[PDB]
């Protein structure tokens, strides 16, 4: 097929370059670390309303999501940027966390580009919003038997405010153009109205505890993203590895060399990576490429016979099955029987070894 002909004459040919096939792949990265203390916020004494929802800055920590996400302790969930399943893989420079408790009957107005009492006066989101919004049913504790009127919400507002621009001043709202005189008067309203949450409330009237997690992109280096896993290392196999973001394929072996406690990567004069420090345990490993070499076919002319021999170059042929035998300095040759007798060369192989056709 290679020679593009139906006749082959005496002589060795080269083709079909050979390389060992890897088995599996591995990942190895530093231990879990300063995880963010957002749990105490979720497990706090007093939670916020929608007029003054808790806005907090989160940075310089890892925020565990999957354990909290897949836990059944949530009610509804909506990520607007990407699939939540890979939330751990996107890193945020800084996270704006917005935690509050409201009545679920207006939860549809939480989403950006929605109209409602809570989506027009106090709580707003931009059209290009990205952050994820999570809500949990919380009628058990937020509700009060006598009516939890400590909670309040911005009932009124003259002009709609920009997203994330909370106003906590409670100046007497002027419904009409008539001037307002005194603390209370005609066309004078209290902007904040008290929530009513009770165990006797039905669906929607049950309070919802909601967290919205927006974040800033690329103006400063990303810092906050979920934890990442790893698998136990293996040795003496041509495998794939992702060490400190460097992906490679090779065989891992122990090393007698000693790095400085600050360098991680070993390089040669040819400027390629050959020694790596494990991130979990402090040790130094050498990387050897798994074997590769072109194949040679030795054959008399197809006029004579059809039997052939195969030579693997630069391969110890204890490693041939992973793809009569005889090893020479040029590689391992199979299909031919070597003899103690000596003749003149007919077809050369190398290192003084020549092959020929002779009787049987």
Ligand X SMILES: *[C@@H]1O[C@H](CO)[C@@H](O[C@@H]2O[C@H](CO)[C@@H](O)[C@H](O)[C@H]2NC(C)=O)[C@H](O)[C@H]1NC(C)=O
Ligand Y SMILES: *[C@@H]1O[C@H](CO)[C@@H](O)[C@H](O)[C@H]1NC(C)=O
Instruction: Give residues in contact with ligand X (CB under 6 A).
Output: 39, 42-43
Q: Supply 265's token pair.
A: 């990567």
**What is the rounded CA–CA span in Å between residue 29 and residue 230?**
6
**What is the rounded CA–CA span in Å between residue 116 and residue 141?**
26
Measured in degrees and rounded to the nearest 5, phi and psi for residue 89 equal -90, -5
- Tokens 């509804």 locate to 76
Identify which of residues 72 and 339 has a Cβ nearer to a copy of itself in the complex.
72
Nearest to 343 by CA among 331, 353, 351, 333: 353
327 interacts with, out of ligand X, ligand Y, another protein, none, CB within 5 to 8 A per kind: ligand Y
Per rule CB under 8 A, is residue 260 in the interface with a copy of itself? no
Per rule CB under 8 A, is residue 242 in the interface with a copy of itself? no
262 interacts with, out of ligand Y, another protein, ligand X, none, CB within 5 to 8 A per kind: another protein
Greatest pairwise CA separation for the chain in angstroms = 124
Burial (0-12, 13-18, 19+ Cβ within 10 Å), 330: middle
170 interacts with, out of a copy of itself, another protein, ligand X, none, CB within 5 to 8 A per kind: none
Identify which of residues 42 and 205 has a Cβ nearer to ligand X in the complex.
42
Q: How far is the CB of 41 from another protein (least distance, A)?
A: 17
- The single residue among 14, 15, 16, 70 that binds a copy of itself, judged by CB under 8 A, is 70
Q: Which residues contact 180 (CB under 8 A, 6 or more apart)?
A: 172, 174, 186, 187, 188
- Residue 52's SS3 state is coil
Q: How far is the CB of 241 from another protein (least distance, A)?
A: 18
**What is the rounded CA–CA span in Å between residue 358 and residue 1?**
27
Q: How far is the CB of 128 from another protein (least distance, A)?
A: 22
340 interacts with, out of ligand Y, a copy of itself, ligand X, none, CB within 5 to 8 A per kind: ligand Y
Residues in the chain after which the chain is broken, C→N over 2.5 Å: 323, 359
Per rule CB under 8 A, is residue 178 in the interface with a copy of itself? yes
- The single residue among 177, 236, 340, 342 that binds a copy of itself, judged by CB under 8 A, is 177
259 interacts with, out of another protein, a copy of itself, ligand Y, none, CB within 5 to 8 A per kind: another protein
**What is the rounded CA–CA span in Å between residue 348 and residue 189?**
104
- Residue 157's SS3 state is coil
Identify which of residues 283 and 346 has a Cβ nearer to ligand Y in the complex.
346
Identify which of residues 43 and 342 has a Cβ nearer to ligand X in the complex.
43
- The single residue among 187, 244, 288, 305 that binds a copy of itself, judged by CB under 8 A, is 187
Q: How far is the CB of 185 from a copy of itself (least distance, A)?
A: 8
Interacting residue ranges for another protein, rule: CB under 8 A: 57, 59-60, 93, 219-221, 223, 257-260, 262-267, 269, 275
Identify which of residues 133 and 239 has a Cβ nearer to a copy of itself in the complex.
133
Q: How far is the CB of 259 from ligand X (least distance, A)?
A: 11
For the chain, how many residues are written? 360
User: Which residue has its beta carbon closest to ligand X?
Assistant: 39
- Residue 72's SS3 state is coil
- Residues 207 and 194 sit within 8 Å (Cβ to Cβ): no
Per rule CB under 8 A, is residue 16 in the interface with a copy of itself? no
**What is the rounded CA–CA span in Å between residue 100 and residue 208?**
8
- Residue 298's SS3 state is strand
Q: Interface residues with a copy of itself (CB under 8 A)?
A: 69-72, 74-75, 77, 83-84, 159, 175-178, 185-187
């Amino acid at each position: 097929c290679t020679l593009k002909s139906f006749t082959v004459e005496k002589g060795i040919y080269q083709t079909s370059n050979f390389r060992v096939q890897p088995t599996e792949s591995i990942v190895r990265f530093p231990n879990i670390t300063n995880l963010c203390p957002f749990g105490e916020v979720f497990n706090a004494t007093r939670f916020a309303s929608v007029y003054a929802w808790n806005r907090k800055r989160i940075s310089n920590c890892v925020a565990d999501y999957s354990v909290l996400y897949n836990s059944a302790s949530f009610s509804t969930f909506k990520c607007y940027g990407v699939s939540p399943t890979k939330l751990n893989d996107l890193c945020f420079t800084n996270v704006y966390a917005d935690s509050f408790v409201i009545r679920g009957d207006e939860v549809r107005q939480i989403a950006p580009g929605q109209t409602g009492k809570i989506a027009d006066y106090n709580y707003k989101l931009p059209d290009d919003f990205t952050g994820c919004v999570i809500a949990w049913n919380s009628n058990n504790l937020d509700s009060k038997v006598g009516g939890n009127y400590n909670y309040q919400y911005r009932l009124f507002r003259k002009s709609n405010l920009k997203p994330f621009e909370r106003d906590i001043s409670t100046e007497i709202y002027q419904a009409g153009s008539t001037p307002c005189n005194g603390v209370e008067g005609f066309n004078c309203y209290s902007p904040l109205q008290s929530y009513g949450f009770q165990p006797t409330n039905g669906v929607g009237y049950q309070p919802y505890r909601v967290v919205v997690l927006s974040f800033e992109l690329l103006h400063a280096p990303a810092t906050v993203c979920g934890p990442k896993k790893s698998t136990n290392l293996v040795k003496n196999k041509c495998v794939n590895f992702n060490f400190n973001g460097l992906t490679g394929t090779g065989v891992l072996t122990e090393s007698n060399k000693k790095f400085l406690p600050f360098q991680q990567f070993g390089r040669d004069i040819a400027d390629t990576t050959d020694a790596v420090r494990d991130p979990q345990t402090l040790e130094i490993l050498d990387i050897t490429p798994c074997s590769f070499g072109g194949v040679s076919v030795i054959t008399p002319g197809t006029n004579t016979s059809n039997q052939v021999a195969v030579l693997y170059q630069g391969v110890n042929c204890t490693e041939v099955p992973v793809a009569n035998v005889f090893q020479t300095r040029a590689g391992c040759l199979i299909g031919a029987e070597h003899v103690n007798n000596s003749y003149e060369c007919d077809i050369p192989i190398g290192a003084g070894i020549c092959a020929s056709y002779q009787t049987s």
